[PDB]
Motif scaffolding. Structure first.
Motif, PDB file in Angstrom:
ATOM      1  N   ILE A 116     -17.682 -48.813  41.260  1.00 41.43           N
ATOM      2  CA  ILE A 116     -18.822 -49.693  41.481  1.00 41.43           C
ATOM      3  C   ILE A 116     -18.359 -51.127  41.266  1.00 41.43           C
ATOM      4  CG2 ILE A 116     -21.188 -50.286  40.736  1.00 41.43           C
ATOM      5  CD1 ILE A 116     -20.743 -47.105  39.559  1.00 41.43           C
ATOM      6  N   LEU A 146     -17.306 -54.581  40.288  1.00 42.62           N
ATOM      7  CA  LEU A 146     -16.987 -55.080  38.960  1.00 42.62           C
ATOM      8  C   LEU A 146     -16.484 -56.517  38.980  1.00 42.62           C
ATOM      9  CD1 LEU A 146     -15.442 -52.822  36.265  1.00 42.62           C
ATOM     10  CD2 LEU A 146     -14.272 -54.984  36.606  1.00 42.62           C
ATOM     11  N   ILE A 161     -24.019 -55.115  40.236  1.00 42.61           N
ATOM     12  CA  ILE A 161     -25.178 -54.826  39.404  1.00 42.61           C
ATOM     13  C   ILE A 161     -24.932 -55.265  37.964  1.00 42.61           C
ATOM     14  CG2 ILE A 161     -24.470 -52.476  38.814  1.00 42.61           C
ATOM     15  CD1 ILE A 161     -27.997 -53.966  39.405  1.00 42.61           C
ATOM     16  N   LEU A 162     -23.663 -55.398  37.561  1.00 41.85           N
ATOM     17  CA  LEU A 162     -23.350 -55.890  36.225  1.00 41.85           C
ATOM     18  C   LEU A 162     -23.851 -57.313  36.022  1.00 41.85           C
ATOM     19  CD1 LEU A 162     -19.782 -54.403  35.765  1.00 41.85           C
ATOM     20  CD2 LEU A 162     -22.025 -53.443  35.229  1.00 41.85           C
ATOM     21  N   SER A 217     -26.579 -58.321  36.750  1.00 38.69           N
ATOM     22  CA  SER A 217     -27.979 -58.198  36.359  1.00 38.69           C
ATOM     23  C   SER A 217     -28.153 -57.245  35.181  1.00 38.69           C
ATOM     24  CB  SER A 217     -28.826 -57.734  37.545  1.00 38.69           C
ATOM     25  OG  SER A 217     -28.705 -58.628  38.639  1.00 38.69           O
ATOM     26  N   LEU A 245     -24.842 -56.663  29.339  1.00 38.07           N
ATOM     27  CA  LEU A 245     -23.561 -56.054  28.994  1.00 38.07           C
ATOM     28  C   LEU A 245     -23.394 -55.876  27.490  1.00 38.07           C
ATOM     29  CD1 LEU A 245     -21.354 -57.931  31.562  1.00 38.07           C
ATOM     30  CD2 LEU A 245     -21.526 -55.451  31.384  1.00 38.07           C
ATOM     31  N   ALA A 280     -18.748 -62.917  24.055  1.00 46.73           N
ATOM     32  CA  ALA A 280     -17.791 -62.538  25.087  1.00 46.73           C
ATOM     33  C   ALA A 280     -18.488 -61.820  26.233  1.00 46.73           C
ATOM     34  CB  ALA A 280     -16.691 -61.662  24.489  1.00 46.73           C
ATOM     35  N   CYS A 281     -19.368 -60.871  25.910  1.00 48.23           N
ATOM     36  CA  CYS A 281     -20.106 -60.150  26.944  1.00 48.23           C
ATOM     37  C   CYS A 281     -21.001 -61.092  27.741  1.00 48.23           C
ATOM     38  CB  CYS A 281     -20.940 -59.034  26.312  1.00 48.23           C
ATOM     39  SG  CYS A 281     -19.972 -57.712  25.568  1.00 48.23           S
ATOM     40  N   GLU A 290     -20.829 -64.429  28.163  1.00 47.99           N
ATOM     41  CA  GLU A 290     -20.034 -65.316  28.999  1.00 47.99           C
ATOM     42  C   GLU A 290     -19.319 -64.561  30.110  1.00 47.99           C
ATOM     43  OE1 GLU A 290     -17.525 -68.138  27.380  1.00 47.99           O
ATOM     44  OE2 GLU A 290     -18.921 -68.916  25.863  1.00 47.99           O
ATOM     45  N   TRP A 291     -18.968 -63.293  29.888  1.00 46.36           N
ATOM     46  CA  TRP A 291     -18.350 -62.506  30.948  1.00 46.36           C
ATOM     47  C   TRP A 291     -19.328 -62.290  32.093  1.00 46.36           C
ATOM     48  CZ3 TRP A 291     -18.353 -58.230  33.983  1.00 46.36           C
ATOM     49  CH2 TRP A 291     -17.127 -57.827  34.523  1.00 46.36           C
ATOM     50  N   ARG A 292     -20.578 -61.946  31.768  1.00 47.34           N
ATOM     51  CA  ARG A 292     -21.583 -61.808  32.819  1.00 47.34           C
ATOM     52  C   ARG A 292     -21.803 -63.130  33.543  1.00 47.34           C
ATOM     53  NH1 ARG A 292     -25.991 -61.624  30.261  1.00 47.34           N
ATOM     54  NH2 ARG A 292     -26.961 -63.492  31.180  1.00 47.34           N
ATOM     55  N   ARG A 347     -19.667 -65.654  33.901  1.00 47.54           N
ATOM     56  CA  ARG A 347     -18.503 -65.936  34.734  1.00 47.54           C
ATOM     57  C   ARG A 347     -18.494 -65.059  35.977  1.00 47.54           C
ATOM     58  NH1 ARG A 347     -14.159 -64.616  30.433  1.00 47.54           N
ATOM     59  NH2 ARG A 347     -12.610 -65.056  32.066  1.00 47.54           N
ATOM     60  N   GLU A 375     -15.995 -66.129  39.173  1.00 48.98           N
ATOM     61  CA  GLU A 375     -14.644 -66.349  38.668  1.00 48.98           C
ATOM     62  C   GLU A 375     -13.733 -65.151  38.896  1.00 48.98           C
ATOM     63  OE1 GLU A 375     -12.450 -66.372  34.596  1.00 48.98           O
ATOM     64  OE2 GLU A 375     -14.160 -67.737  34.397  1.00 48.98           O
ATOM     65  N   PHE A 376     -14.295 -63.969  39.139  1.00 47.73           N
ATOM     66  CA  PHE A 376     -13.522 -62.736  39.175  1.00 47.73           C
ATOM     67  C   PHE A 376     -13.258 -62.222  40.585  1.00 47.73           C
ATOM     68  CE2 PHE A 376     -15.778 -61.875  34.914  1.00 47.73           C
ATOM     69  CZ  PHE A 376     -14.913 -62.741  34.275  1.00 47.73           C
ATOM     70  N   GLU A 405      -2.635 -72.002  41.026  1.00 50.84           N
ATOM     71  CA  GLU A 405      -2.661 -73.014  39.975  1.00 50.84           C
ATOM     72  C   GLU A 405      -1.616 -72.718  38.902  1.00 50.84           C
ATOM     73  OE1 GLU A 405      -3.345 -73.657  36.644  1.00 50.84           O
ATOM     74  OE2 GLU A 405      -3.124 -75.784  37.136  1.00 50.84           O
ATOM     75  N   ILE A 427     -13.146 -55.810  28.201  1.00 50.94           N
ATOM     76  CA  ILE A 427     -14.403 -55.584  28.910  1.00 50.94           C
ATOM     77  C   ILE A 427     -14.142 -54.964  30.276  1.00 50.94           C
ATOM     78  CG2 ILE A 427     -16.382 -56.725  29.957  1.00 50.94           C
ATOM     79  CD1 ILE A 427     -16.489 -58.627  27.673  1.00 50.94           C
ATOM     80  N   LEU A 432     -31.399 -56.677  33.103  1.00 49.50           N
ATOM     81  CA  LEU A 432     -32.054 -57.865  32.582  1.00 49.50           C
ATOM     82  C   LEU A 432     -33.454 -57.992  33.180  1.00 49.50           C
ATOM     83  CD1 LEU A 432     -29.091 -60.411  32.804  1.00 49.50           C
ATOM     84  CD2 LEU A 432     -29.793 -59.019  30.850  1.00 49.50           C
TER      85      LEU A 432
END
Lengths: 96, 304
Positions: A2, A4, A10-11, A13, A16, A67-68, A70-72, A74, A79-80, A91, B280, B302
């Protein structure tokens, strides 16, 4: 399996911080748990050094929660995506 | 003007930072209550946030370590150094790098001292080692620090972002009381933090335990020798031993408390500087691969 890595995952939303915790970690097979602990901070990895049980404050943190979150964020910022990953590799080439 | 990484404001962070500077007899602790007694403080660091009698002699400001903040994100290091390098030989041993920095900047202008701070690889490395990954990737409002320290019978207020060191200090009777007065003049709140630079509590507690244990050994030896020999009374030796045992128990508990507090400092540092990205990612990937990511995600959407 799924999405990521894309803002349409969906992550992006999903809460995390509530997804990844001690019970959810317990859902995983032991080899997975070992390979996953090998990615924790050295103090918590050392605390867990045949199902592995994590510290009650290993994932329930102040730093892992942020961390969770800010990961969501980002992930939402994009960023991913592999294009941004290759751009960051260009870079990194420029840096070295 | 190169730029250092940004640090969080935590007494444990600053304690571990000073330990990484090679200065091993110093510990930073937060001051929740201003009136509570503090024993043997080397100085104070005042952090302020979200808010709107000068030594002007060019020879006086150079005769003391008043450095000017040239590196932008070096505020915590700058305040800690303004406190420590204005201490003398009797109580603490600065690190080798800190002592070299102190002798190197003996008569320099505030600017030159700030530049010496900024161009010390040890200090920059130790400071940036405590940065979170957020600060590193951000490199591609924070706090403002002010140091308070007694020099020679006078309390000094050093601000790295101000032209002159503020001397407004005199007391007679103890400098902690003068500092309390000065702080109560200008002043729970989240716009203000106050931290004390104190000697390592663990060291003092261990030494007190050593003294208590050797005294207890002396009195127990004499007591058991007396009772074996079998004349005079032995009430007072037993009373001495009872009180020594009570004090040893109290100080052992103190040492245990301080040890777990130091361990908490260590674990907070190890988590604060960790990049949780790979963890993660692999966690979510293993959850998906196991087939259970869908249910969990469906349970924690959410609200919208």
């Amino acid at each position: 399996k799924i999405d990521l890595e894309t803002p349409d995952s969906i992550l992006a939303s999903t809460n995390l911080r509530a997804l990844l915790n001690k019970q959810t970690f317990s859902l995983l097979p032991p080899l997975y748990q070992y390979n996953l602990i090998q990615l924790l901070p050295s103090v918590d990895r050392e605390a867990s050094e045949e199902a592995i049980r994590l510290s009650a404050s290993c994932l329930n943190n102040e730093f892992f929660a942020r961390a969770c979150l800010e990961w969501r964020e980002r992930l939402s910022e994009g960023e991913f995506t592999p294009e941004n990953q290759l751009k960051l590799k260009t870079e990194a080439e420029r840096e070295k | 003007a190169d730029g250092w990484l940004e640090l969080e404001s935590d007494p444990g962070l600053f304690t571990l930072l000073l330990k990484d500077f090679g200065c091993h007899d110093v510990q930073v602790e937060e001051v929740y209550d201003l009136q509570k007694p503090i024993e043997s403080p080397y100085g104070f660091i005042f952090l302020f946030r979200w808010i709107e009698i000068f030594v002007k002699d060019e020879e006086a400001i150079s005769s003391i370590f008043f450095a000017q903040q040239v590196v932008p994100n070096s505020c915590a290091t700058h305040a800690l150094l303004s406190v420590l390098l204005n201490c003398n030989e009797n109580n603490l041993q600065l690190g080798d790098t800190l002592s070299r920095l102190k002798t190197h900047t003996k008569g320099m202008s505030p600017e030159n001292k700030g530049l010496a701070i900024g161009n010390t690889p040890e200090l920059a490395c130790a400071h940036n080692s405590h940065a979170m990954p957020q600060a590193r990737r951000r490199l591609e409002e924070a706090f403002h620090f002010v140091s308070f320290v007694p020099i020679n019978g006078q309390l000094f207020e050093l601000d790295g972002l101000k032209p002159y060191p503020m001397n407004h200090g005199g007391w007679e009777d103890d400098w902690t009381d003068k500092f309390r007065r000065v702080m109560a003049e200008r002043l729970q709140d989240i716009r203000f933090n106050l931290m004390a630079v104190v000697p390592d509590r663990r060291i003092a507690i261990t030494h007190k335990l050593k003294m208590l244990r050797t005294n207890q050994a002396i009195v127990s030896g004499t007591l058991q020798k007396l009772l074996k020999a079998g004349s005079g009374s032995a009430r007072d030796l037993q009373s001495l031993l009872k009180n020594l045992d009570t004090e040893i128990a109290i100080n052992e508990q103190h040492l245990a408390d301080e040890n777990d507090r130091r361990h908490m400092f260590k674990v907070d540092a190890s988590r604060r500087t960790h990049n949780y990205d790979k963890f993660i990612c692999t966690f979510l990937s293993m959850l998906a691969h196991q087939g259970v990511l869908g249910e969990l995600v469906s349970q924690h959407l959410l609200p919208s």
